[PDB]
Amino acid sequence: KYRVRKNVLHLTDTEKRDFVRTVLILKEKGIYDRYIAWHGAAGKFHTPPGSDRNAAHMSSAFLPWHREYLLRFERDLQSINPEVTLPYWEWETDAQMQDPSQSQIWSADFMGGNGNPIKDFIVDTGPFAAGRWTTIDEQGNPSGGLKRNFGATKEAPTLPTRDDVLNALKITQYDTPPWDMTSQNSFRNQLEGFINGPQLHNRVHRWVGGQMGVVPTAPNDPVYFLHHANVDRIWAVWQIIHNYQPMKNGPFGQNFRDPMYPWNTTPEDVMNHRKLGYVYDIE
């Protein structure tokens, strides 16, 4: 309950510089590539084999997998600097902005800015610009150069709104059969963004574009963690207002006590975010 996760827009300047410097350090030590690789690995673990579902996305484990993901990331951040906690990007408020690209998340001292149309939309500002930050492709091989392109696609021209978010928190069930993209009246599938998609979570990914635009390369962009921090917050909220489903008979890897590949951690291990030792501000 001690580690406090803060709204990016509530961060002081040196809180932002310290977060940024820690990420780069994780990157120089080779630790950051473990999270890109883990996330890609999970995308290849289909439950059961052949199914649309994988360990991290498109099924019930989406939320607790990403909670465990961000939890391990935060610990590695803390091992470099015990004062660093993972912020969240509250995109529901940034959507209200005239030009959400002008949000202070995108400043030169934090995430850097939008892509540059001449340089194929390569990011050329901030600490993660090309030459200052290398990316890896789907194969684990060097791909060179972070890209972003806010709202370029017909499908996600806008960030999801607080209206969009308030409608997901109403859903009464965590998840429903058959625990996938078609799951109806499903908090998880609603938050993930496949109901009349792309919405919420999936919409943020398409709006940002670049590596963020395609799931297997998305964690190349450090804003991946800030986005998913916000998703984890929405879920923790839902866990106050209103457990987990399936408790059994889902495909292996999605049940309450199944390990989530590529870890041994179960959903049950992370149901209560407070017991994991962190809290979001406003809590």
| Binding footprint of a second copy on the chain (CB under 8 A) | 29-31, 33-34, 37-38, 40-41, 44-50, 54, 134, 136, 139-142, 251-253, 258-259, 261-262
Select 53 or 203, whichever has its Cβ closest to a second copy.
53
Q: How far apart, in whole angstroms, are the C-alpha atoms of residue 175 and residue 188?
A: 6
Tell me if 99 is assigned to a ligand binding site: no
Nearer to a second copy, 3 or 34 (CB): 34
State the alpha helices, DSSP H only, in the chain: 13-28, 32-43, 62-80, 91-95, 162-170, 187-192, 200-208, 223-241
Say whether 246 sits in a helix, a strand or coil. coil
Flag whether 180 is marked binding: no
> Are the C-beta atoms of residues 266 and 256 closer than 8 Å to each other?
yes
Q: Do you know the residue count of the chain?
A: 283
**Smallest distance, Å, CB 51 to a second copy?**
9
227 is in an annotated binding site: no
Write down the least CB distance from residue 37 to a second copy, Å.
Answer: 5
CB 257, min distance to a second copy, A: 12
Considering beta carbons, is residue 9 or 24 the nearer one to a second copy? 24
Provide φ and ψ at 257, rounded to 5°.
-115, 20
Nearer to a second copy, 90 or 180 (CB): 180
Q: Three-class SS of residue 280?
A: strand
**Which lies closer to a second copy via its Cβ, residue 151 or residue 216?**
216
In sequence order, what are the residues at sequence separation of 6 or more whose Cβ sits closer than 8 angstroms to the Cβ of residue 65? 42, 55, 56, 260
CB of 65 to a second copy, least distance (A): 14
Q: Are 217 and 91 a contacting pair, CB within 8 Å? A: no
CA distances from 272 to 67, 175, 238, 260, 276 (A): 10, 17, 12, 16, 7
Which lies closer to a second copy via its Cβ, residue 45 or residue 173? 45
The least distance separating a second copy from the CB of residue 171, rounded to whole angstroms, comes to 28
Q: Tell whether residue 163 is among the known ligand binding residues.
A: yes
Report how far residue 193's alpha carbon sits from residue 183's, in angstroms, rounded to the nearest whole number: 11
Q: Which residues are annotated as a binding site for Zn(2+)?
A: 10, 13, 39, 46, 52, 57, 66, 68, 92, 109, 120, 163, 201, 205, 228, 242, 273-274, 281
Q: Which residues are annotated as a binding site for Cu(2+)?
A: 39, 57, 66, 201, 205, 228
Q: Which residues are annotated as a binding site?
A: 10, 13, 39, 46, 52, 57, 66, 68, 92, 109, 120, 163, 201, 205, 228, 242, 273-274, 281
